[model samples]
Target: HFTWDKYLKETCSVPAPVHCFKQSYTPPSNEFKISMKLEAQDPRNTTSTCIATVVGLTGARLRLRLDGSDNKNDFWRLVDSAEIQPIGNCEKNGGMLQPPLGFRLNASSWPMFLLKTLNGAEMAPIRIFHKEPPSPSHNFFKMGMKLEAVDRKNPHFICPATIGEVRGSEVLVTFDGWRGAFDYWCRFDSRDIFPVGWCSLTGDNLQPP
Candidate 1:
């Protein structure tokens, strides 16, 4: 385990203060549990919606596995993410749910797959999710800024990262331990990038370098 308090000071690193994060909001709780069901955007097919099971939880984020998919591809989404919602919201709004990409069985098994996945599953409460915070008016991020960020390859881990570079509205997120292989560039207002101390507030793990 790493002590963020000392790590930052030793590296001459500083956090992007919480007040500067306009798109960040403090969720009331990370109380979601395993086996809860919800609707989420299919990570492989971003345009499609799918039924998801909450296989795990960390802080305010849920470890979601797509219905009929293998465990290797499970993804994480914050409780306040607009990308997730209470079960039945998809059909309530007249959108059809799709099976996971590369589903384990035949395409004909989908209806049954959906049935078995939801059978007796607890539905996530809508109250757990509300509107996400609005974006900042402009990208005030600077190079060398330190913050916590989702490791896209390993979504379960919120690792320490730095602002490797800034290109207009996009900031380059470079992981501290694993070099540039996991680095990504995203808009300053992206939900995946968060101010430091965010994990402390949410009870999420902050990985060491």
Candidate 2:
């Protein structure tokens, strides 16, 4: 492997989580609602727009998974609603990009780092709620963790839920919430396992209210 020993710095000493951003915003309660339409940067066109929803919630951390996307099962966390706003809005579109992982270098050097991360060598950082999680102690999960969680709402299934990725104070996972396919990225901290917008997202077909 190429030696990046000297290239390491703060992250090595602090263990920077994947979603650490310049600014962090939290969601209200266990869930929240999407008040307006937003534009997402689809790699297919780069400047194009895509459908998205504020799926899950954990304090200020809003779990925003795309409506229909498959960038290796991509999802973003701790994202601000402002970053996703009215379509055709230039200011809002500017904030959609996330900083790459292990980004301990200068802003000018980010382009090269981004190119490498897009290919899959380095994982990108996502957002999450650090102050709280669904489970106590926020030990709700760990890297490579797995669970057989029920949707607790609709299309109940025992398919599987796996910890796809984890960032500082946050976790990323995929679940068979729908029929028997994929609806991933329940972005949250350890304590956010409780239901928030579950009823809203799944239409409460099986939710207990």
Candidate 3:
């Protein structure tokens, strides 16, 4: 078994207390299924809403592929993320669905693509979409606070990490033993991070340091 104390001592770091992270006490459940269609904010163009299909599922996150886009740009979003919503949500809220970044077809063909993609599509159930968790009152992380974080380069891997730096609302997640290869800066409330024991409780794989 990999003990954090021994590992921390070997690496000269310390664990971040649970309170420092913005994660929910209980990890949100993933009730979504493959091929279910939904509305998602384009990761590359956050202000644009696009049609997305669930290509894969991992714990509480969905691997989303934009309908008008190619498979190469698939991105992951949590079930409870505010960035995703049920079909027609955009229209209901006075918003328009836009083609994803790097859309595969000509700009003129997007209307037909959107219509066909939603015609008889398997839309995810409204009940399956959970409300997004509220953000913490403020940024509280400190440097050297150990945590578990998703390796953005390899999205599926959640590994042991340390808080390399904290600047305003953004925190730098540095993967332990990975030198500086996989570190990234994200908002303090970003869902890509979790408390130290998050993987074991969620049955998700925690990559070794």
Candidate 4:
């Protein structure tokens, strides 16, 4: 592993070119405040849009806790991340917000809960949202390339990573210190992966190995 560091230092420079967005735009500053209500993709049920509360803040990211879910699964997302949006966005687009998978309260109370949660609450500005990027024409990554990736197991943390393996249209994200514990295979165009300077440019924390 000692020589591995030397190897990364030698051949790789700059992040593997961010192709994760549809249009190149500056990342947004996280001006969201605690208790703000927003629509977010439930980390547990990716297809479900649910109410999320901004429970905490860091740099340019919002630490979001699903309104009805347990605190254990709270996650962080950059202001420009496509997974989050201002409240009512789902309905405006003709979709209904679902209750979180394990809503703490009785099912019948959900409507009341949602109503109370949004009563005069701060809402994230729509301009802070960005267009979700599409996948690349094909997997263009090569082995040993450096990049920034979200630790899917611990969905809130983004850490330095390398392309450990490339197969078909999937790329293997191997964490630096996390090495094997956090490694996983994902599509080449996954939004969770970003160019090397992404954190610096967005004012997000880049965890060192």
lDDT of 3 by residue, 1-209 (tens): 78666887888877777766667778889888899999999989999999999998877778899987777778887788888999989898898799999998988999899999899999999898988776788887999889999867766667899899999999999988888996789988888898787877776767888
Best by lDDT: 3
> Model 3: runs farther than 4 Å from truth?
1-6
In model 1, the worst 10-residue window by lDDT is 19-28
Ranking by TM-score: 3, 1, 4, 2
* Best-first order by lDDT: 3, 1, 4, 2
- Tens digits of per-residue lDDT for model 4, 103-167: 99998988898898888878877766656545567777888778878766665566778889999
**Pairing residues by index, what is the TM-score of model 4?**
0.82
lDDT of 1 by residue, 138-203 (tens): 778889989889877788888888999988888899999786887788988787878887887888
What lDDT would each prediction earn against the true structure?
0.82, 0.36, 0.85, 0.75
Better of 2 and 4 by TM-score: 4
What are the clashing pairs of model 3? none
TM-score between candidate 1 and the true structure: 0.91
Q: After superposition, how far is residue 98 of candidate 1 from its true place, in Å?
A: 0.8
lDDT of 3 at 65: 91
Give the C-alpha miss distance for residue 9 in model 1, angstroms: 2.2
Per-residue lDDT, model 3, residue 13, is 75
